[PDB]
Amino acid sequence: NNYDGDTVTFSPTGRLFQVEYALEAIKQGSVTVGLRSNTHAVLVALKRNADELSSYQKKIIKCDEHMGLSLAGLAPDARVLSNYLRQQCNYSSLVFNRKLAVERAGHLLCDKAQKNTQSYGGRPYGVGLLIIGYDKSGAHLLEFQPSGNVTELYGTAIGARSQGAKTYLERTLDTFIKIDGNPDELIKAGVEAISQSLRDESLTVDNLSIAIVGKDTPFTIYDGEAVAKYI
Amino acid sequence: MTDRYSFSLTTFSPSGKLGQIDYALTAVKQGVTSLGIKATNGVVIATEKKSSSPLAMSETLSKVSLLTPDIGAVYSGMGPDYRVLVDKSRKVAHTSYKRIYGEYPPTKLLVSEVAKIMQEATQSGGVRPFGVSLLIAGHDEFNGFSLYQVDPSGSYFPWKATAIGKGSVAAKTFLEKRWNDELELEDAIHIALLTLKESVEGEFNGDTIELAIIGDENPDLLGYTGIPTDKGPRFRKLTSQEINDRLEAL
Amino acid sequence: GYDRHITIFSPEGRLYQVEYAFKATNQTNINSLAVRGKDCTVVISQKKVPDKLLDPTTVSYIFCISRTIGMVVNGPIPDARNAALRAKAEAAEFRYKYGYDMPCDVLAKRMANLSQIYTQRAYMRPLGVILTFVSVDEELGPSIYKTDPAGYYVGYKATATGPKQQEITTNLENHFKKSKIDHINEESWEKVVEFAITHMIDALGTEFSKNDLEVGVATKDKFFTLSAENIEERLVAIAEQ
Amino acid sequence: MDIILGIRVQDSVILASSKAVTRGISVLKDSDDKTRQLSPHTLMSFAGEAGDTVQFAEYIQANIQLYSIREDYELSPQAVSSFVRQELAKSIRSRRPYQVNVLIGGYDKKKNKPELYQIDYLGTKVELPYGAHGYSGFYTFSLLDHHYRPDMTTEEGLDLLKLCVQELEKRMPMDFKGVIVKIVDKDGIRQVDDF
Amino acid sequence: GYDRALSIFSPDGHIFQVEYALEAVKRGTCAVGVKGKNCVVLGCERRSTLKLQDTRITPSKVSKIDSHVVLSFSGLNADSRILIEKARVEAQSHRLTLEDPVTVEYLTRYVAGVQQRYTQSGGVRPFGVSTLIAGFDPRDDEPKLYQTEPSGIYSSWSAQTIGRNSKTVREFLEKNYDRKEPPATVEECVKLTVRSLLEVVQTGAKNIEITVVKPDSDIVALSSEEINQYVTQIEQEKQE
Amino acid sequence: TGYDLSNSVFSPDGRNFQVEYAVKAVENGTTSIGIKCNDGVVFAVEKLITSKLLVPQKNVKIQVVDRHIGCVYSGLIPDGRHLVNRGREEAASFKKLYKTPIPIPAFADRLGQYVQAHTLYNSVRPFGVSTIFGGVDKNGAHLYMLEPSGSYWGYKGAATGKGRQSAKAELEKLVDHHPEGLSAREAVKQAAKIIYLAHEDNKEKDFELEISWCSLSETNGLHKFVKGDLLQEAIDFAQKEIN
Amino acid sequence: DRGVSTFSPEGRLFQVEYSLEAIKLGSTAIGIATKEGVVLGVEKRATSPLLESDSIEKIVEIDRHIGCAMSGLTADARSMIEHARTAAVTHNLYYDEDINVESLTQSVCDLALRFGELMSRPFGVALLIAGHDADDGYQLFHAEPSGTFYRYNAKAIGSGSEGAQAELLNEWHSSLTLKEAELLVLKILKQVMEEKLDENNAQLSCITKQDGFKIYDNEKTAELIKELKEKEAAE
Amino acid sequence: GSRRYDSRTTIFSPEGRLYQVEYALESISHAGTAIGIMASDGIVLAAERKVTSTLLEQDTSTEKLYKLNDKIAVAVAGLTADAEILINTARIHAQNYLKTYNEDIPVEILVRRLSDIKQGYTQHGGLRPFGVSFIYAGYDDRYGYQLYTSNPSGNYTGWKAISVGANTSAAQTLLQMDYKDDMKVDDAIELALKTLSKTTDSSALTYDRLEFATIRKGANDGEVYQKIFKPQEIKDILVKTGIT
Amino acid sequence: QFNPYGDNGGTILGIAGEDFAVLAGDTRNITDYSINSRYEPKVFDCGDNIVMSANGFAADGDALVKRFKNSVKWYHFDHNDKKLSINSAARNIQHLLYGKRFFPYYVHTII
Ligand SMILES: [Mg+2]
């Protein structure tokens, strides 16, 4: 109200409204789902078009051979944060000959976002991210909020109507965590999860975007006729 | 962090007034009275030592300050602002003059440097004006004895005699009746003590009054002998006893 | 009304942020007192540990700035420690540059100048503290110099700070009106501490245990604080006459 | 480059400058013009280290042309020569100094007088009736000391200049491929196309 | 450093500081440009509220940027000096590096670029100046006339006016200027330019300045008497 | 009014309202505690299980500084991470120049001065965390708690977050009933109980317990996380006491 | 006042949303992508008849294989064009090849959100970037001041955009010839323009693999306008 | 943060005016009147000191008339402290030019430089403008005797006769009435003093309330002399012209 | 005085066929008259069907190959996984080398 003019101001109840407004941009974004087993991790994203002449906005970005994310909210902010992740993954490989742990990548994203919430002149990031990866401790899924809060999960969803997919994953938890050594079934579970968030529209061949990383699987993105098999 | 106030805090109002300078002058008006009188063979500057507590040792608080051996200063208004201005004035007398010409600046030019510092606090980013008016007395070979007033705006004017602060309006009228161009230094000191008594409520003695002169060279205060051309400082602060001696002939 | 938020002049020529910093000074509800002996300078301050979960040995508002200089603070502990760290840095730098120990009055002036800057520069706020510096100076002898949020400072024969400063001040004034000297005419610092505690008891009208007080003593070439058991010995001597 | 000469007569200043450009082993060009017009009545010839000569000359030219446009006024030869001297005096204590020596020939329209200034790369300025840089003066000054008169015509100045060039062509070891000669007077700057 | 964003968008998509800079131009004295078949004429209004002026030394309204290009303006006089100095420096820089003087379009594009920059840089306000830039490209005999404004947009004009009451003189030019047959001589072009200013000026005395630019760096400012002869001939034809 | 719209502004009371609003964010956070024992310190924190999809034991909250200091905080988690990052820089530079690992009181002031610095200007926001930290140095065990104002003191026991009142009362009983002191293993058990008891203020969702400790005898003065059998033993002891 | 980088309660940046309003006031620009090339067309919209309309430059070459049309505060486009040209040329210097149309567009869009208290405000202009590369063929992108860019088969920006986009929805199919696209841009520009469309107040351009980016002569466009008039009178 | 307290000194009003410049001009309209008159054989500068005192040391006092070099002087109207900042900058520019070209700086070039400095404070930096208007009296060998004025906007213009400060409307009308082109310095001296005498807000015009200066080629042969009048010399010229 | 350069010996050979190419090198690494390693790989697969060797001072050689491999990675990131053609790789390596024109990589590179 009187306390939402900038990110450097607490409200009388201890809230940061500019951060909360940045969180609101994610809720307007298109739905994206993340889930994992013990061998693989999967991203599923519903892409949004401007109209029937337009392309569908890409949602998934590769960060390294073993890591990548999906976005919901301001796309240019996701480009800035994913570029930072690419650099940090790269620094780890060049200097230490070491693939960057997914948990450490989450810590780095948290700290980068935090600096934009405590200083004058800046603004919070207006995007949410779902990071999947396979490192020395197996498969991982992270959820990033521009408040700085990063959380490790078995499954989750962000964007508009993400609550339907999140409840489905909460039911299916005991089933999909056991889908080891079967990439196609794990993606099926993710496609079924994201379906619990659709209204009026359904998953088409230029609508659907899928990514997977695992034990002997580099981070790869599937679009176009490559996802028709799952429609 | 970083100073993010890079804009002026003093600006022109629709009526053409610079508010912050006017308000600084109001702070000076509330300040304790100080005065200066120029004689043919010297200048006197004086003020009241308004002690904040009787447990305070008011001799450790100097309202009259030596700037150079031949230049002294007194103020009305905010004490702390004065103290830092005295530090800056002492330093600028060296950096912008003595380290260049090998001699101390003439009164008018040191006044000019102090004025410039006060002007800049009126235009520079993220600062308020100084809340003091200064009276600067001094002597130099080619200009003789002189007395200047410097205001928060940075403006300065030369005076034969003047007063600033609390009871300045009444004190200036008192000085207009007594001043002539034939006064000797002792006459000016006498008039200074008479003028200052009017604005002082409580005790009026050598311990509650601070008074200094710019007069003859004091070879006894030089600290060394052997160089004929060096004859000692013309600034001298009167002692508590010296003031009381002149209060009997009052 | 933004002339109340930053350090610029009000229409009356006042600095409200400076005035409000003086009010923050009494937020701890602690009173302090300083007096001078023949050979020493003593400072005492109330100690209140309101929480049983606190480690009482870490609750302090007296600071050892240098070997010779001590400082008691009236105001919140964050601003107190800010000022303490700076005073320690300034004293150490002085000794390095000029080859002799920083005098008590010179450190007070330096901290007062820093405070003056906060009243003139908008981006910096005043510290909500009053700083009382004590030492036995090698030139001036026993010394008390006190700084405030306005950038004002002066020397004292004796002084008091806190919510009930006036009561202590008047009590001290009355004693020095009788004795007609600028100090406590006593040989040992132990008896000067006993004088300081006695006159605080008289002025505040309250009794003190060993854990209710905090004492700092400056002698030639060192400033030190007393332990609870040293204070207890002081309290026993007061009660026994 | 090599030989640059100057002579101030009654009503004009004459500058003579060699045409050769030599890259160590070979003479790459024999028609090089070692001069820049700074303003309608001011000409500057130059010699020194390769590259720096033309870079400095064009830099000066640009600055004087800028002044002319800003004020709608032509600076006096004295004022131009002072500006050039300061630039070279600044340059000599730089990281990499301009290794350039110049002659400035101008006609002052206010005083109705020709003026010749000699400035070396250090910023050493002198006003002269005649001047040179490098070894040129060693061969020509004894001839100029003998024949020069302050009331000489332009034609007499050119004839004395021919005698100087002939002595240079006789006793100098280097082939400088002749000189381009330019005259600066009340009507401006012109080139003598047969010399 | 002072970084405050003074030029920003409003809810309706307007940048008010740029639009208010145009209001400063509206207040400035009228300037007009007309191109003939082989010349361009720049006319300027001088407000006669200031007499006891020394006209020898007072800043003239038309400024040479190079020997072949001129610039006139309407708006804040102090602001215009900064644009004129920058343009003059760029003109010499172009000669130094390209070894050819600026085209009129290039010089216009540069000045317009400077004006645009001051509409999305922190800590600065836009120029309260619109300009008319006229001249001939090197070794070209085709007349050139361009206009710039505070926003930084620029364009070429057969004839144009800026400043106070420029709506009136543009009205005149739009009905009196024929594109198929532009003023064939210097005389005809100067006459049409003086006529256009007489719609707005007041007394045809020291209130009208006229500068003629022809090809090959031929630029001359007309005197009071020469302009006065145009003023005389125009009204004697009008008495009919 | 308007005194609460900008950091570092004194109100007519002499208060910094922006710092007081930061405390509200701290009070909104989960419960975290610290217990000082005979030869060390124990830290414990309540981790709210927002969903079944949270991977158990993975989202670690307690942080190590150097090798001998543990840090836990309640409020805005990112702010706490920023403070620990600074603490790690401070500890590194101290050890670089002076060789010895940073003493706990020395480390306390480094955090204190940094947090206090964020109350001096309007260009920064105060920290939205209260941090409980400590460890073992050459003078023994030390436990500290640091507030948004920059204020810190030494503690026998400390608590912050939504269930701080409940926790404080439990800590006060331990101080009274053990003037001689508490063993490191006893302190781990007691820490488990206190977090379980303090979880009543957050009873809607279930939680995960996380404990760490530094002890001269039990961990060689190094900070370690309580894991496996010792953690389960503490969970059992806690569950027995609430029933 | 309020920060230049402030979010609204709906999660949108105030300044970006306001710049989009300025673009709505701009003159119309239309692009149509076919398998034979991409066409770009603009409304010139001269403010007065004395303004020489061929000095209005709202279609611009970035490289031989990439063109661009603008709508909104067109002065703001100059530094964007400068950056685009530099990025295209720099990539050719570093990699001895043509830059991809998408990569060029992304480089331009990276400038967009570089404002705060960097430039003081967002750009007040939208761009249609058209081109060809070997990997993705003929492409048309819409670059906004939000930093977002969408690829389009056909797109209209400026004051007549929503009427024009509805028209493009009906007319575009994957088999359009270059000639059919040219007439289609002219037809829709004529529909949304205030003044009557001719070769002096409208401008056409195209990008083909063979000939690269070309701005059409007024004589060439005049013929296509005459061809349009006759085929509309043909039924 | 800090934006809250920023007055924004360099913005346009909806009418396209610069607030701070306009308000600074309002300030200057209360300053003592300064007049400059240009004649064929020299220039006169006359200015009124603001309500003075009998205890002010006049013979060492300077608030209106300042020397920039041997050929150029200025009359000040506005904040004296602001003026001295600019005056020192102008003195340095003149010496910079003399060092660079070995010729005295032409009057207009000095005026343009100071005016550009004033302009800068209106367009960037977020600082308040200088509350000063200058009258420049000078001589160079290109244009001869010249009068200019500059104000806080950084705009400058040339004049045959001009006033700044208080009552400029009344003063300018009186000057416009009696000024002629063939006028001489001694006639201009009289006009300047007569104009101040009629426009002054004081009861009478006396020597202690005036500062006076002339720039004459009344220096022995082809050279120029500046004369800052002494208090007694102002008293004599007041008697000579019949005002006292 | 410190010499930042050394010589690790080695010999490499590249031959282009009609529809193939070979890049060969010996595996011996040396300083002065000593053998450091009998098998230290010197020719590297850099991705996108490109092989590279930077022979001479091995520290500079390893640094250059490492930076080029990195350049291939970022080319994919920045240009939609486009394959880096051999001519484009060559021009890119020129800029990597000339970037240190006044403190050169002391190697002879072949791709
Ligand atoms: Mg402040």
Q: What is the CATH number of the domain that holds H204?
A: 3.60.20.10
Count other C-beta atoms under 10 Å from residue E139's C-beta.
Answer: 9
CB pairs under 8 A between A and G: 85
Interchain proximity F14–C21, CB inside 8 Å: yes
**CA-closest candidate to residue C91, choices C77, C105, C73:** C105
| Angle, CA G96 vertex, CA G91 and CA G101 arms, to 5° | 45
Which residue in F122, F125, F162 has the most chain A C-beta atoms within 10 A of its own C-beta, making it the best mutation to test that interface?
F125
SS3 readout for A110-169? HHHHHCCCCECCCCCCCEEEEEEEEECCEEEEEEECCCCCEEEECEEEECCCHHHHHHHH
Q: Which residues of F165-176 are buried (b: 16+ CB within 10 A; e: fewer)?
A: ebbbebbeebee
**CA-closest candidate to residue F114, choices F139, F143, F144, F90:** F90
Residue of chain I whose Cα is closest to the Cα of A94: I66
Interchain proximity A152–F54, CB inside 8 Å: yes
Q: What is the CATH number of the domain that holds G42?
A: 3.60.20.10
For residue H145, give the H/E element and its range.
strand H144-150
Count: domains in chain G? 1
Q: How far is the CA of C118 from the centre of ligand 1 (A)?
A: 4
Decide: H and E in contact? Rule: 3+ Cβ pairs under 8 Å: yes
CB pairs under 8 A between F and H: 8
G117 touches chain A (CB under 8 A): yes
Q: How far is the CA of E6 from the centre of ligand 1 (A)?
A: 25
Distance, CA of B78 to CA of B98 (rounded, Å): 29
DSSP string, B175-233: HHHH--TT--HHHHHHHHHHHHHHH--S--STTTEEEEEE-S--GGGSS--S-TT----
CB A64 within 8 A of CB A89: yes
Chain G CB contacts of A5 under 8 Å are 2-3, 6
Count: domains in chain E? 1
Return the axis-axis angle of helices E77-98 and D52-71, rounded to nearest 10°. Answer: 150
Backbone angles phi, psi at D153, to 5 degrees: -80, 170
State which amino acid sits at residue D67.
Y
Chain C CB contacts of H4 under 8 Å are 2, 5
> What does the DSSP 8-state code read for residue B18?
B
Q: What is the CATH number of the domain that holds D19?
A: 3.60.20.10
Count: domains in chain F? 1
Interchain proximity B9–H54, CB inside 8 Å: no
User: In Å, how far are B202, H79, H154 from E78, measured between CA atoms?
Assistant: 59, 21, 5
Chain E CB contacts of H161 under 8 Å are 52
Q: Which residue is listed with tokens 């794990």?
A: A186
A58 touches chain I (CB under 8 A): no
| Chain B residues interacting with chain C (CB cutoff of 8 angstroms) | 3-5, 9, 20, 23-30, 52-61, 79-81, 83-84, 87, 121, 126-131
DSSP string, F7-31: TTPPPTTS--HHHHHHHHHHHTS--
Chain H CB contacts of E79 under 8 Å are 119, 123
Beta bridge partners of I56: I107
**CA-closest candidate to residue C101, choices C70, C133, C68:** C68
C88 touches chain F (CB under 8 A): no
Q: Give Rg (Cα) of chain G.
A: 18
Q: What distance in Å separates residue H106's CA from the closest CA in chain D? A: 10
Interchain proximity I66–A90, CB inside 8 Å: no
CB B236 within 8 A of CB B71: no
Identify the sign of the CA torsion A111, A112, A114, A115: positive
Q: How far is the CA of C106 from the centre of ligand 1 (A)?
A: 23
Chain H CB contacts of D68 under 8 Å are none
Chain C CB contacts of B26 under 8 Å are 9, 11-13
Residue of chain F whose Cα is closest to the Cα of A121: F123
Which residue in H5, H7, H127, H128 has the most chain C C-beta atoms within 10 A of its own C-beta, making it the best mutation to test that interface?
H5
- For E205, the domain range is 1-240
User: In Å, how far are B193, D72, I27, I61, I106 from D79, measured between CA atoms?
Assistant: 62, 15, 72, 59, 53
F236 touches chain C (CB under 8 A): no
CB F33 within 8 A of CB F167: yes
Q: What is the CATH number of the domain that holds A226?
A: 3.60.20.10
Count: domains in chain H? 1
Interchain proximity A121–G12, CB inside 8 Å: no
Q: Name the burial class of residue C45, with classes exposed (0-12), middle (13-18) and buried (19+) by CB atoms within 10 angstroms of its CB.
A: buried
State which amino acid sits at residue F117.
A
Touching subunits of G (3+ CB pairs, under 8 Å) are A, E, H, I
| Chain B residues interacting with chain H (CB cutoff of 8 angstroms) | 4-18, 38, 108, 112, 115-116, 118-119, 122-126, 143, 146-147, 153-162, 172, 175-176, 179
Q: Which residues of I55-89 are buried (b: 16+ CB within 10 A; e: fewer)?
A: bbbbebbebbbeebbebbbebbbbbeebebeeebb
Distance, CA of F55 to CA of A173 (rounded, Å): 11
Q: Which two tokens stand for residue E149?
A: 């404004």
Distance, CA of C69 to CA of C218 (rounded, Å): 7
Q: How far is the CA of C115 from the centre of ligand 1 (A)?
A: 9
State which amino acid sits at residue D16.
A
Chain C CB contacts of H2 under 8 Å are 122-123
Reduce the DSSP state of residue D116 to 3 states and report it: strand
Give the strand pairing for C141-147 and C130-137. Answer: antiparallel
Instruction: Please list, in sequence order, all residues whose beta carbon lies within 8 angstroms of the beta carbon of residue I106, skipping any fewer than 6 positions away.
Output: I5, I56, I57, I60
Return the axis-axis angle of helices G101-109 and G77-95, rounded to nearest 10°. Answer: 130
SS3 readout for A40-51? EEEEEEECCECC
B13 touches chain E (CB under 8 A): no
Distance, CA of I95 to CA of I84 (rounded, Å): 15
CB E126 within 8 A of CB E18: yes
Residue of chain C whose Cα is closest to the Cα of F34: C53
Touching subunits of A (3+ CB pairs, under 8 Å) are F, G, H, I
D73 touches chain E (CB under 8 A): no
Question: Structure resolution in Å?
Answer: 2.8
CB F141 within 8 A of CB F39: yes
E3 touches chain B (CB under 8 A): yes
The arrangement of secondary structure in B1-250, i.e. its CATH architecture, is 4-Layer Sandwich (3.60)
Active site residues per annotation of F: 30
CA dihedral D127, D132, D134, D138 (to 10 degrees): -110
DSSP string, chain C: -GGGTSS---TTS--HHHHHHHHHTTTT---EEEEE-SS-EEEEEE-----TTB-GGG---EEE-SSS-EEEEES-HHHHHHHHHHHHHHHHHHHHHHSSPPPHHHHHHHHHHHHHHHHHBSSSPPPS-EEEEEEEETTTEEEEEEE-TTS-EEEESEEEESTTHHHHHHHHHHHHHHH-SSS---SSHHHHHHHHHHHHHHHHT----TTSEEEEEEETTEEEE--HHHHHHHHHHHHT-
Q: Which two tokens stand for residue A97?
A: 């000959």
Count other C-beta atoms under 10 Å from residue C140's C-beta.
Answer: 14
Q: In what order do the strands lie in the sheet with B132-140?
A: B65-68, B71-77, B132-140, B144-150, B156-158
CB H145 within 8 A of CB H39: yes
Q: What is the CATH number of the domain that holds E62?
A: 3.60.20.10
Return the axis-axis angle of helices D136-147 and D154-171, rounded to nearest 10°. Answer: 140
Interchain proximity D65–E92, CB inside 8 Å: yes
Interchain proximity H126–B125, CB inside 8 Å: yes
- For D55, the domain range is 1-195
Count: domains in chain D? 1
Distance, CA of G30 to CA of G79 (rounded, Å): 22
**CA-closest candidate to residue A154, choices F210, F78, F51:** F51
Distance, CA of B148 to CA of G177 (rounded, Å): 89
The arrangement of secondary structure in C1-241, i.e. its CATH architecture, is 4-Layer Sandwich (3.60)
Distance, CA of C105 to CA of C146 (rounded, Å): 9
CB E117 within 8 A of CB E82: no
E92 touches chain D (CB under 8 A): yes
Interchain proximity E57–H143, CB inside 8 Å: yes
- For A161, the domain range is 1-231
Beta bridge partners of B12: B18
Q: What distance in Å separates residue C29's CA from the closest CA in chain B? A: 22
A11 touches chain F (CB under 8 A): yes
Instruction: Please list, in sequence order, all residues whose beta carbon lies within 8 angstroms of the beta carbon of residue B23, skipping any fewer than 6 positions away.
Output: C9, C10, C11, C12, C13
Q: Which residue is listed with tokens 């070279």?
A: D88
Backbone angles phi, psi at A95, to 5 degrees: -85, -40
Q: How many residues does chain H have?
A: 244
